[PDB]
């Protein structure tokens, strides 16, 4: 009874990931094929109907279902539209699209995070007893100039056709509240190159050099310098947050910077402690120097165990 619709989605490009909105842009084609009333075509060859002419055929009573991207944000930019009307009854809708799609995205492991770009297609009006998805084909390019792309795709697209029961609506026998939904996924991983060498590494060097405060001889030298190190961390926090993607939570890099504040605030609490511990007002050079490699180890250890 239900019309069988074969879908094919060509994906050209996924880009423009929005971290805060949890969205991403997808350019590609969508093709839908189904079979209906046989038809007389000019010269008996298949008939082509382009763009504005499709509207005319719909007015004369041509059935073209309103397949909707469930997880798209706002009406997508539909390029050229096309109807291929065959004489043996079948009809093929082919259209190019560019739209912003939504999915749950966890960027907490940034810059070493993995995401999956999802498309979800479903009829807008017709339930599963009226319109059914027969199969889904997804074609992507095998791009291996990987390095220039931010994301390494881990495989061809994985699909999953299913039925979605919508509870609220004015139904009939319990089988008019279900809708056929295509669900496409494309797993990918972020290229951590740029972020390792231009953010992670310099931050390491800066945190490291913060420890060289202990190797200063005088006390005034040690304390006055820590305020300059503190200033440097603030400068670097501004550097990162301004260029790095904005999020509602802390990344790996965000934590390194918090640790820097601590490594310096700790130092300020120690640089100041050695100067007043022992009796006879002696310069407690016994506690410092022990610190000249207690921090370079304590941080390079205790910070090495954040394997959550």
């Amino acid at each position: 009874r239900p019309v069988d619709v074969s879908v094919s989605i060509f994906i050209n490009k996924i880009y423009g990931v929005n971290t805060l909105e949890q969205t991403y842009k997808v350019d590609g084609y969508i093709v839908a094929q189904w079979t209906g009333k046989p038809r007389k075509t000019p010269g008996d060859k298949p008939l082509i109907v382009e763009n504005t002419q499709i509207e005319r055929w719909i007015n004369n009573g041509l059935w073209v279902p309103a397949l909707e991207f469930i997880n798209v944000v706002g009406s997508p930019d539909t390029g050229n539209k096309r109807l291929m009307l065959f004489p043996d009854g079948r009809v093929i809708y082919n259209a190019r699209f560019l739209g912003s799609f939504s999915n749950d995205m966890d960027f907490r492991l940034f810059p070493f995070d993995r995401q999956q770009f999802v498309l979800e297609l479903e009829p807008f009006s017709y339930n599963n007893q009226q319109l059914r998805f027969s199969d889904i084909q997804v074609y992507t390019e095998n791009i291996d100039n990987e390095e220039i792309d931010e994301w390494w795709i881990r495989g061809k697209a994985s699909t999953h056709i299913s039925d979605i029961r919508y509870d609220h609506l004015s139904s009939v026998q319990p089988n008019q509240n279900e809708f056929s939904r295509i669900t496409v996924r494309i797993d990918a991983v972020r290229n951590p190159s740029y972020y390792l060498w231009s953010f992670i590494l310099p931050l390491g060097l800066i945190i490291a050099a913060s420890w060289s405060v202990f190797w200063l001889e005088s006390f005034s030298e040690r304390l006055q310098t820590s305020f300059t190190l503190m200033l440097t961390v603030v400068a670097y926090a501004f550097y990162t947050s301004n260029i790095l993607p904005r999020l509602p939570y802390t990344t790996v890099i965000d934590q390194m910077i918090i640790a820097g504040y601590g490594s310096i605030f700790a130092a300020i609490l120690l640089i100041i402690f050695a100067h007043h511990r022992q009796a006879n007002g002696v310069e407690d050079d016994l506690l410092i120097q022990r610190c000249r490699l207690a921090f370079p180890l304590g941080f390079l250890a205790i910070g090495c165990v954040l394997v959550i």
Copy 2:
């Protein structure tokens, strides 16, 4: 006499909060159901009319009221439209929408501020004696992994149908100046994680470490250090204000920074006083040291009462 319209609003996604404009984006569906004169439909199943075809039915005189979002800013992006014409007279209008809505939003607290995302629906032309909202149903998705979202929705939507008296009208007829209005609310709180660890805490450490200036031995050491601390607060004010949401008033964080400027400007007025308080311009080591725990408490006291 007035027509009964049953409304149902599905909410898919709330995002894109604009702090200055006091707005926010809402993606979802809207469903309107009413009953009118019965109709003979193809076969006996409900007839479906999608998008451009709905326009034609209205020209032939089908009644479809123009329900307007009162608090939307600019015409919303309407996706797919659908009319389900039942034979028993009913009719169901179903449409996808994405629009920027407005509401009063108080960000004076932050990042611990609470907001409620509001929708207000009302007929554009028909008063309550012509068109009345019978009931309103609001369905939202259950965010289970809310930890990664910016906003945590704290409870289901509250609905409320009411009547609106518009005083300044053209005609009057004492029963033609009232309009039926649906009002949906969704209370929510901001995820304060990122703002606590990456802004609030370091500022505390910096404000704390600012107090360790008094522990410098020389007078020259103490005063020259205060100028580097001053620089750090300016840098940190620039750091926050550039990434934090812009507002026309001071937040909690904005207040901490002003306190930082003062705690440092105060110290400069004290470090400079000790050098000339006692006679003979002696370094008043009796006055300082009293400050080594007057600020860590004085700042931690008078500042502890910010209940404004």
Copy 3:
């Protein structure tokens, strides 16, 4: 002979002030009422015509004049349209609008500047002998919680109907060159809270603390500190300009920064002069210390020039 058009403009929201472009967004409704040839209506109650149907009525020869917003920048976003056609001939056009409007705006007194948001309405084709504005009503909401708004609206809107002679025209004969124009104004003042406590005040403290350089004993101490102060003002100059609205001229805050640069550059010219002033090339500690309150007065004097 000319048609009387009674206008009513409901204003919902004014926002999105663009300082460089001198523009602002206005959301609201517009209502125009006039009378023409009587008409046969379905039943005998007034007939309602919404949105797309208005176009069709115009084709059958209904007169609907093209009232234009003179000072709008780009075609405004028109929401729902409505014609209420009464049987006794009169017609009421009601439509919601959101557009970016233009006016002359002086931001020299920032953050204590005052502005008036202006709307200018005028027929596009029909002169004053064809279409005339009878009266104009402008309704605004009573802003109660203005403390959280950026702009405080002072008093209700002032209206102004007038006539404009367009000199250059083709058929003319000084009788077809005049047009009826409604002009609405809304005075408002900027909320100076955020700008006073987070910008004006800290800059004062920094300018104040810049004077505390003179209380340093050594010469090297005084000069080396001045370079850190110079750096601090630059840091603060970047801080302000990045968040403050861009303008083609200097504001109040912008000038304080120039004064800060001067007060520091001046000090550098004295700290350096004292080291070489009178005979014996004496470290003129007789000149400094006299200076420890010459700047705190000199700056509050030469800078006090409330002449601008």
Copy 4:
């Protein structure tokens, strides 16, 4: 035989200069008048046709030529349209427009640069033997309070109708390859006020104060101070580039900053030279002291010859 079209372009507002794209926005009206075969209008009075109705008249075979803005970037936002059809044959097209126009713009003399805003109008389909521009009028508003505007328009607009030979074409009779083009010009200058007081002047003071390094007594003082001076120029370089308009080449201010980098790197090369020039490592205080006004003159010289 060729049709005479009289053009009149009212200019309301020029704004939104994009420095990188070399474009600018222009709001205004356009008027085109031509005459053809006389016409029957309801009443012997002129007939007015607004907006959507113009399409209907064109379908019935009314000739309305497609005058195109040659130097516009993307289709302009056309507001209200109007046809004024006179009975004696003449026709007047009136429409409001807002579009982004392109032109060659040299910002090398920034902030003291001069530009000319250009409009170029030409028929899209009809050559000069079919449609010819008779005359061109350009009307601008009286800018009285130009102190608060970004751009000062100097002098009235200059117009110029001309002919353009399009070499590549298909048609025979080689006299169908020329098109009538209106070309409007509007000279204007940038308001150099803000940039002089908030960028140029502080830059002078900062560059000036960099020279005061030579008046430090010790060698350690002079070299260590230069590193703080270096930091200031970088900070000031960041200040400018972030607020100043982005360009693909160096302005006047940009060069002062390069000179600033040099004057400090130069100073470091002299401070370091004096300390090892003479034997026995004696401090060449003759080289310094000569430098106390050699840089204030040497820099005020080499930079004084930027007469490009």
Copy 5:
């Protein structure tokens, strides 16, 4: 059987390169000429059809194929449309367009990178047996005064007609696939002026002056100064990244900055080593002094090998 289509693409302006999305804007015209069934035209002169009228002719059964830009991102902004219908059967479609095109772009050699702006044109519905591109002409403005443009075009446009086999397509149907595709290329180079003088050069001076730390006499002077130098690099990394185009990989400039971080961290490791190398804790001035030209050469040697 297949229709011959002669294409001509005029390019007016290439601009607005987006580095992250790897896109660019292109303004220009497109001309397509083909021949079909002859027609009787008004006045027997070639008939011109502009904009909205083109739609009418298509409804009357005029064949106008839907040529698509393969590598465009989103529906392009089509300005004025035109059909020139000759009586002898031939047809010329002419329209202006502005669209954002996509292509592979390698910015690793930035600011010394070379790019090619590509257009790809192909029919949307009709294969090569139905519609074939006969020839392709691409016209650009000659070598003008390119000094003020961001991009210098180094050579004329290269054209290439070809056939593209879609293995996976509609049904299966062999040898009914393959599409005639025009492919335009325009090689260009980036204007390296601004980036050489305002980014590369100061960074050299800053990196150079960092080496002058070794010429400081004391140990405290050298180590404490390195912390000021470190701060300077962070400031410069923020300066560049904020102004420079954002990318997912390291550029040439990005690497220079990494070298800056290292040269300083290295310096801190040597300055600190000399203080503890030789016995009795003597300051190893035998190691330093050699460092006064080990870094200016070592950095320019082992780190400068920009070979591998």
